[PDB]
From a paper:
A single ER‐localised Fic protein, [name] ([name]), catalyses both [name] and [name] of [name]. [name] is a class II Fic protein (with its αinh N‐terminal to its Fic domain) and an ER‐localised type II, single‐pass transmembrane protein, with a short cytoplasmic portion and a large luminal‐facing catalytic domain (Worby et al, 2009; Bunney et al, 2014). We report on the transition of [name] from a dimeric enzyme, that deAMPylates [name], to a monomer with potent [name] activity. Mechanistically, monomerisation relieves a repressive effect allosterically propagated from the dimer interface to the inhibitory Glu234, thereby permitting [name]‐competent binding of MgATP.
Author numbering:
A (entry chain A), B (entry chain A): 104 to 434
The structure:
Amino acid sequence: LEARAALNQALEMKRQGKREKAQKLFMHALKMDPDFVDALTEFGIFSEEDKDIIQADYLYTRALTISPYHEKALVNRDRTLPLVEEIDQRYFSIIDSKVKKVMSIPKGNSALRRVMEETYYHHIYHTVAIEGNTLTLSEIRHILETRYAVPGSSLEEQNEVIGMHAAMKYINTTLVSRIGSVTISDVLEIHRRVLGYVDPVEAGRFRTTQVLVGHHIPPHPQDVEKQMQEFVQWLNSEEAMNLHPVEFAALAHYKLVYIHPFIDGNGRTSRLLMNLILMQAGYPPITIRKEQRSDYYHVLEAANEGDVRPFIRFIAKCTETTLDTLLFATT
Amino acid sequence: LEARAALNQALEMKRQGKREKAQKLFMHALKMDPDFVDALTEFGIFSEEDKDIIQADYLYTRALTISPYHEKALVNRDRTLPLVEEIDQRYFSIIDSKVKKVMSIPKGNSALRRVMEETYYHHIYHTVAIEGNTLTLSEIRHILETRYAVPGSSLEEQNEVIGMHAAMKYINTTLVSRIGSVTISDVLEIHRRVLGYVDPVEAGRFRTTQVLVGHHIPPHPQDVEKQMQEFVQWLNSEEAMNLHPVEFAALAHYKLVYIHPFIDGNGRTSRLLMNLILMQAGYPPITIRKEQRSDYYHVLEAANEGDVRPFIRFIAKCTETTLDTLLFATT
Ligand SMILES: [Mg+2]
Ligand SMILES: [Mg+2]
């Protein structure tokens, strides 16, 4: 048991007062056994000493999903759960007050006008770049302003960009202002534009083949439609409307990605649905940056393994970064 | 009546023995009055002297569609109608025997192999060039071989080309060899690929707005579906199967263009349907050349004004040119 060995080194290393070695030893131990209950528990206690309550609670919560009767994780989780709820609520309150300031700024303001036009091309850049698109911000600007092809670049990559433009224009023209319930048709019409210029056969229609997505196996094609019916019901439900808008938008994003209803364009379509929910709640649209790709996939994995909270927190931080930029620009 | 004046000059000019002036004077007169019964009749008699029986009969036939009791057109038409039927049949027999020779040539032949690969890119070039696409044969070859964009050319123009490639590949993979009836779905699946990369919203769905096409007003959108049902019924009918394949393929082309079922891609889709019918009858695919555009539109106009025979003859000549090239190349 190299797992059981690595932990005892980590605990010894902590006792001595070497945080950095202990840190790595805890990580090494959980790489060797990701379901190692005592390693999660002891790394949690360690994290609380650095004042990282959220991480400690994530670890205790994970431990219990494996061994729900582990006494040391249970006693600790019972303390941290209500505490982390309060910390998470307090962060939503900081976001709420930062949105109030941004909502207040006069609509004509020359600074706010400049920022919003840049973030349009910026959103297209990052949302395609995240899927492996190699086009630059300026190349994307050239494609959308002139409608002419960029030299020595794949037509497919350029068609992903005009697809994103057509989808966002459709959302802003037809959906953002529309009052009433979201429909499966709304999602199909978004996808039709996202993927239409790349794969017109598959655009606007459900995946017909089972796939692997990282370590995720999504619903079988035969179940995709019913899962999407249950999803849009949730989008229109009472409990969804009573969530904080950032949590509602984050969970809508995660649920759609989990279902993976299309052969491709699931990520791009989910990030558009997120921004529709946020904008309908009077939030600004947010952009998960190309550089955040690895963090993005890590919090999706944590959600798949049973805890969606790090994903929600990740979307909350993206939402705060977006607001900070707008406030800064108009201050 | 400048019409009545121009004719009398033409007749006088013919009496004297000046064919060229008379020719132009007859044309000038029919420009001024396209329904001028005596001008059509007298130009017909003139055409018979040059041994142009087909033109003379076209003119007599046109005269009678205006004035069905004009005695001089009627006596002439009654003579030329059965004669032109025989001449048209004899041309179909020359085409039939030229197809027999081409069908015979060994399938492995290195010369036949070379020709057919060139005509693929050649077909895409002419079918898009006819619709106003400014891309060159080599630019089209670069787009389809590399999938990379050509410098300083519109994405739309390049997407028309990958659409044509996807449609032709689909036809050859799924339709050409398939046995049984053609369906409306087959036509929608062709259109889905033809227009999918340019207009994914409209690809594979019937026109929802009334349009003008030259001087042609097609069926109103509310009638498009029923007209397409009647059209595919005709495609699968007994009378269609008993037509000469060239006449069947030409009339299928004309009927679909007349209905104009889509917002765009009607021409490209009709030329594909023509080549599917020809190839299923063991004919080679044909290409209406960019340079023939004006002749093409002239015979479509003659069909709209009540005589489809010049259109059928035009497709027959295109079919003979195609065969002559193949025979030449392998001789
Ligand atoms: Mg590049
Ligand atoms: Mg050019």
